[PDB]
Amino acid sequence: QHGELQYLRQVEHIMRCGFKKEDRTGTGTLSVFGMQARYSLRDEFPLLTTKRVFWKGVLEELLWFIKGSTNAKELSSKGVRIWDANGSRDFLDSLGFSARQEGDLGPVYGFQWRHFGADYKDMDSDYSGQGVDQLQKVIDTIKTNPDDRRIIMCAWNPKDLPLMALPPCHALCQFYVVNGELSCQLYQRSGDMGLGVPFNIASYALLTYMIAHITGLQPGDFVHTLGDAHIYLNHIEPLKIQLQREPRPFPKLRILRKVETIDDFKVEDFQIEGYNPHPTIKM
Amino acid sequence: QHGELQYLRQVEHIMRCGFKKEDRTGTGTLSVFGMQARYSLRDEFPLLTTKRVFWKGVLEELLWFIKGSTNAKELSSKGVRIWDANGSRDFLDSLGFSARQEGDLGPVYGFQWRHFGADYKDMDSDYSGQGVDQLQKVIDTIKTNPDDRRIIMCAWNPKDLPLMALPPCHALCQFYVVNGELSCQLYQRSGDMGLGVPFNIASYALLTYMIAHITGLQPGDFVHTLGDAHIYLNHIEPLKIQLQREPRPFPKLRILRKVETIDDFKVEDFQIEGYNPHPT
């Protein structure tokens, strides 16, 4: 069986057994609470094929995260517009952040991952040597002690919550090692199956490939755990279509050079081979 | 059909397909990474029956949590010894906490749940009005806005980690509401299937029952997600025996009176009916 079948069976399930549940905007969804899929990272990459995934966006965003940025403009400049809406003068004002300059997303992933617990001022501030560098922490631990059951990188910070444009959908992820293979489990509190999910799977599978490469291990599995797994009421039609399609063999991700530290990774180092998806779908 | 069959199928799986993996003590285990089970809370309580669960302990511990305590002695005095070992003068010293008094577990669940982000000194300190009161937070949100997808109570605190005797096994839990029913999902980073696990399921199922009672909702489901799900190499034999037993119908949890706030709960308010488990 093809790995994508899991994601498809989930969507199929949310439609068949989900419950109508209101949205924060009032759009309306069909949801199921608590789900889980295991995507293999062994000699293949989980880039969904029944619908084209914005790969260039998942890669630029991840590097942007690793770099510890919280400025949407720095990701926008790379040709990835995904986080721009949450950075607009209009949106940041509808939440009270009036003195907060444009693009300043607040203490999001980039900040939490590298400086957990540090006092956030603005995106342009210097947090060098401040907070807990969780990203580095997990890498060190994976190297020194692989048996460790506390390899956690937590983006969810209850105290910093009031300063965020958007509370982290990916509350936390945990790494694991066995048989010289590195695995990763993500806890996604809320997931849009028609848009965000596929991209999110790619994002974390990539992170694992990166950390595995640096630690000298082989990619294992990517366990995708969900809280509120939803499908927006309008996405039902196109999704009924996508569910008809047959998944084509997953591509493979090549890391073109030998990099030593997580920060040393650049876009030219990655190569997606054989990514042959079905035509794209607007949602 | 029976809810316990899930837990049994998991143990069965960990034996059948797990991999030998070393322990922090070097005891050795058989593990699988990433697992999940859905226990129904509708008209029944998930207190496992193929082996007796220390129910009096899950209840006293939970209240102890809610009370925001981090002193092991306060739970030990109630006749629940589970957290005593981690509080001894010997253990606290083998980790460096020499000036830390006996029983002082550090900024554990009780402290994180009620005062997240506050500067921890010692168990006897006064943290009134300090930190983020997560427990209260989720209760308020469940009442005012049930559709909310951010109802999270996080015990994992990367900054306070160096002050803990034991890093929280239960990193975080998330609440959900639909059809007037309250559900809960737990993220357990590491779980011992032979001991802590069944107790852990009971603990969180109970918490849901309490919060559901207070918010005026009905208990829904308890989703149990695991990171490193293991079985110690020595528990393999007794477990092979437990797996043979047939689960008896789950008991029911009765809340004997109408309580208003989470803190108002007392031991006399709960009653387990029909808990008929298998022996030893």
Ligand SMILES: Cc1nc(=O)c2cc(CN(C)c3ccc(C(=O)N[C@@H](CCC(=O)O)C(=O)O)s3)ccc2[nH]1
């Ligand atoms: C309700 C909601 N659901 C989401 O999934 C969501 C996701 C993000 C961020 N995210 C992680 C995204 C991943 C992929 C995206 C997307 O817009 N893809 C477009 C291409 C636009 C571009 O060129 O930048 C597409 O699929 O056509 S957006 C922000 C707000 C959200 N809001």
Ligand SMILES: Cc1nc(=O)c2cc(CN(C)c3ccc(C(=O)N[C@@H](CCC(=O)O)C(=O)O)s3)ccc2[nH]1
């Ligand atoms: C290796 C290991 N595995 C565990 O599951 C574990 C659990 C706790 C804490 N936990 C939350 C526990 C739940 C139940 C417990 C127990 O000791 N039950 C006994 C004794 C109490 C009694 O029954 O009077 C038993 O049921 O026999 S201990 C502490 C260290 C651990 N260490």
Ligand SMILES: O=c1ccn([C@H]2C[C@H](O)[C@@H](COP(=O)(O)O)O2)c(=O)[nH]1
């Ligand atoms: O990477 C992401 C980010 C966001 N979302 C979607 C899920 C919900 O549709 C919405 C978040 O809304 P709240 O749960 O924050 O209300 O964004 C995703 O699916 N993936």
Ligand SMILES: O=c1ccn([C@H]2C[C@H](O)[C@@H](COP(=O)(O)O)O2)c(=O)[nH]1
């Ligand atoms: O409620 C609990 C508390 C502890 N443990 C067990 C699981 C592990 O065997 C051990 C903790 O080991 P570390 O994850 O800290 O290495 O305690 C449980 O299963 N449940």
